[model samples]
Structure formats: structure tokens, C-alpha cells
Target: MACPLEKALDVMVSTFHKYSGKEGDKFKLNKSELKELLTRELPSFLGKRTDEAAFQKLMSNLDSNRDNEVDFQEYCVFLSCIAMMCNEFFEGFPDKQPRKK
Candidate 1:
């Protein structure tokens, strides 16, 4: 349970729950904080840039069930794919995380 991969999975869970309660869906992740989180860490999601269309596509993905709120399963479902991209995400580190619009 101490491997780097294992630790990162926990971050996925905790980070999901972190924004889960920020607005509603006490047991699910709302888009508000999820949005902040993505823009914070996964700017790679939008083809190395952040855009509403891309993020909304992301939101649409997370809400594959049409709930628009990400449940634990929903989050985990996207985890593998995201983690794969996330691995592709760490090639060069030359600047900040970039949370700007």
C-alpha cells in the first residue's frame, strides 16, 4: 500500500471527496471543486490548454450517468483513463500548474 501508484489512487479518492461536499451531493463530487482540481493539476486534459469546451467535455465524461455529479464509481471509472493520461502528463516540468482561465 506504500507504492507510489497506490498512494496516487488515494489522492484520486480523497481529491474527489474533497470537492464532493463543497456544494451539494454530500456523497459525490460536484463540478465546482472538481473543476478547480482539474484546472489545477490536469491541464493536460484540454490538449495542454484549458478551455470551457474541453472542461465541459470532461464534465460530460464524469457524468456519464447524467447525474452531473461524480459518484465514487463514476470517478474510479474515469481514474484509469485519466491516470494513463496523467502518466503521459509528466514529461516536462518547466512552469507552474496554471489555474488561470
Candidate 2:
């Protein structure tokens, strides 16, 4: 396998830029973009929350260094996990399986 991880990362990062902000701008995620993405896209285990305290705790666990913000490296790591999960998730579909030789 070619790993495809880097390619996927590029695609995801592109999407991040497209949706989060414009190109030629510094690649960073603000609190609003980060929060929207988490609550909308990440799995329940990662982002689901019932209150601010829970959400803050989740962010703390993922922030990696207590840095109030999650930089590209941290965000990319999280995105990679999402990509992997998507791969595994759709892989379960019979229609997605490889054909018999």
C-alpha cells in the first residue's frame, strides 16, 4: 500500500483551508472553527459533550501541551485519526469491498 495517508492529509488540509479560512493566510484554526468541526465531525468519543466543562475537558485531553490552541501538528494528528476511522467505517460496506479475483 502507498499508505495514502499523506495524500489524505493534503486533501484534508486543503478542506480545512477552504472551509476554515482562505489560502495565502496563516494556517491556523480559531476557536470557532475548531469547535464547530469537533462538534459536527468528530466521533462522540472525541467531541460529544453535554456541557462546557465536558467540552473543555475533551479539548484539554487533545490539546497535547496545555497550549490553549491546537496547532497544525496537533490538528493534523486528530484529522488523521478521523481519516482512518472513515476508512474503517466505509470499509464495512459490502459494496465497498474488493472484487474476487
Candidate 3:
């Protein structure tokens, strides 16, 4: 069996592939695919009302290489930044201990 972190890594890669390859490059996520992935997979992060302008701005920021698509490296970096944000949020609540899983 894969370890916990290994499973998480696998899920990340698989999730990317699951949304990719529908229209364009198989290894990258086009804007629609990226939007779908974010809306479906990260709904809480994006919230219920994902406006078009906000999505456009986010897409612009995420496409660091300006290739008009998001590659795995870019996706990873984005996810890492989100993880850091979550960490920071949790760090603010040191007194409120997290419940045991």
C-alpha cells in the first residue's frame, strides 16, 4: 500500500490528468479545464460565486510562463502556495487544537 503522502501525490497527478486532455494538450490544462477543475475540486477555495473576471485574473496569475495553459509545474506551485496559505491560517489558531483524525 502507498503511504499517505504518496497517495496524496498520486491523487494530485491523477486529478490533473483527469481534467486535462479533453480539448487541447494532454499534459496541460487549458482555461476551461482549469476553471472546471478549480470549481469542482476546489469549490471551497473558490467559493460558490466564481465570477468570470475573477477567474480571468486568477488564470493570468497562474500562467506564469504565459503559454495560455497551466502545466504540471505551474499547478504544483499553485497548490503549494495554497497549502502555505492554509498553513498560515492554521498557525493563527495555535490555541484551538485540531481534532484528532
Candidate 4:
């Protein structure tokens, strides 16, 4: 079995492929692309009521040096957070839940 980090990476890459119209592509995610995807698909997996403002805030916060674009590492962290949120929201497993701290 793959480790959690490896599994998470697979999930992220698969998700990126699903959205980017081609598998194994490495284009940077623009604000509009991020917004549309989050609004459309992420709410189901990420939790209800996810909005553009929240999404923007998340991206900006994670961008660190304010690059306005997320590289692979940053993108991986973002996907991991979403996956954690999904597991927590649906499963309600407090012990396994992710912490913002």
C-alpha cells in the first residue's frame, strides 16, 4: 500500500488532470481557473458553502511570498487540505481529522 502522502499526491495529480483537460500537465492554476473549479466541484468534497472569497483567501494565504500562482508543492498542500476536509466533514472522525494548527 502507498503511504498517505503518496496516495494524496496521486489524488492531486488525478484531480489536476481531470480539470486541466489533459493528464500529466503542469500549467499553473490561475485565479479564474481555481475559482471555477472550487465553486463547481470542490464543495461536494471540501464541504458545503465554499465561496470564491474563501477560495481566494486560501490560495493567497498558501502562496506565501505572494507569487499569485501555486507551484507543485503549494498545490499539493492545497489538495491535501481539501482531502483532509473531505474526510473530516463526511466521516466525522475527530482523531483522524486534520488540524489547522
Q: If scored against the real structure, what TM-score would every candidate get?
A: 0.48, 0.42, 0.58, 0.47
The stretch of ten residues in a row with the least summed lDDT in candidate 3 is: 90-99
> 11-101 in candidate 3: lDDT tens per residue?
9987776665555556567544555677678875544353434444445554635546566786665556445434456352221224583
Ranking of models by TM-score: 3, 1, 4, 2
Better of 1 and 2 by TM-score: 1
Candidate 2's residue-wise lDDT over 46-81, tens digit each?
A: 434423353554455456454455578767655554
Ranking by lDDT: 3, 4, 1, 2
Question: How good is model 3 by TM-score?
Answer: 0.58
lDDT of 3 at 30: 57
Alpha-carbon runs more than 4 Å astray in model 1: 24-26, 31-36, 44-47, 50-56, 59-65, 84-86, 89-101
Model 4 residue 85 lDDT? 41
Superposition error at 81 for model 2 (Å): 5.6
All candidates' lDDT scores? 0.55, 0.54, 0.57, 0.55
| Model 4 lDDT-worst window of ten | 88-97
lDDT of 3 at 52: 39
Model 1's alpha-carbon lDDT is 0.55
